[PDB]
Structure formats: structure tokens, C-alpha cells
Amino acid sequence: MNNHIRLRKAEGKWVIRTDSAVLGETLNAIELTEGSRDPVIYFPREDVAMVMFDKSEKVTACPLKGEASYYSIVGASGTLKDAAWSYESPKEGLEAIAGYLAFAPDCTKVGQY
Structure with a gap:
């Protein structure tokens, strides 16, 4: 009865940024792939510039x-509404990403350095 979630260590230095600021660099990103979906990169919170973030009502x-x-992420151009998320109390088997942040690609760029 397999769910299809694979978690791997993202190799090398991974960065999250906007078109105008660098929000995070990490050597400990986790790659989460569910089935044949594009993998999503999860960043540890300590490595993200959380001062620029406001918790949202959305869940x-x-x-x-x-x-x-x-x-929501605030920047030079304004607020990026609901542009990041985190599984702060993950279900069993996914505790490795507890509190890590992942990011909406429509307004952020994530990638290996």
C-alpha cells in the first residue's frame, strides 16, 4: 500500500531568491518527490531569512x-502573498521536513548554486 513519497538530501548548495533579494542558502535542503511530480525543495528554517516572512491565515x-x-514574503516590490509554506507538524514518516520551508515558483527561484 505504497504512498509515493521519496525524500533525499539535496546535494550541494541550494538557494532560494526573488528577483531582488536572496532569502536562503543551505547545504541541507531536502528534496521531496511525490510520484512523478516535479520534486519540491524544502529548506531548513534556520537557513531562511525569516525576518522577511509573515505567517498567513491560509492552511x-x-x-x-x-x-x-x-x-507571505515582504520585499522591495511588495508582499508575495502565501508564497511559502511549511509542514510544521508533519504526518508519520515525514518528520525530516518538520518546519522546513518550500516556495511558490511563480514568484521565487530555487536552484542549486
Whole structure:
């Protein structure tokens, strides 16, 4: 009865940024792939510039991972509404990403350095 979630250590230095600021660098990103979906990179919170983030009212439920809390990111151009999320109390098997942040690609760029 396999769910299809694979977690790997993202190799090398991974960065999260906007078009105008660098929000995070880490050597300990986790890559999460669910089935044949594009992998999503999760960043440890200590490596993200959280001072630029406001917790949002939005939440979403995922049967496999748990409840996603959302955050808005403030920058030079304004607020990126609900542009980041985190599974702050993940379901069993996914505790490795507890509190890590992942990011909306429509307005952020994530990638290996």
C-alpha cells in the first residue's frame, strides 16, 4: 500500500531568491518527490531569512504530509502573498521536513548554486 513519497538530501548548495533579494542558502535542503511530480525543495528554517516572512491565515491539508502553514514574503516590490509554506507538524514518516520551508515558483527561484 505504497504512498509515493521519496525524500533525499539535496546535494550541494541550494538557494532560494526573488528577483531582488536572496532569502536562503543551505547545504541541507531536502528534496521531496511525490510520484512523478516535479520534486519540491524544502529548506531548513534556520537557513531562511525569516525576518522577511509573515505567517498567513491560509492552511491546506495534505493526506500524506499533514497541514501546510503558509507565509507571505515582504520585499522591495511588495508582499508575495502565501508564497511559502511549511509542514510544521508533519504526518508519520515525514518528520525530516518538520518546519522546513518550500516556495511558490511563480514568484521565487530555487536552484542549486
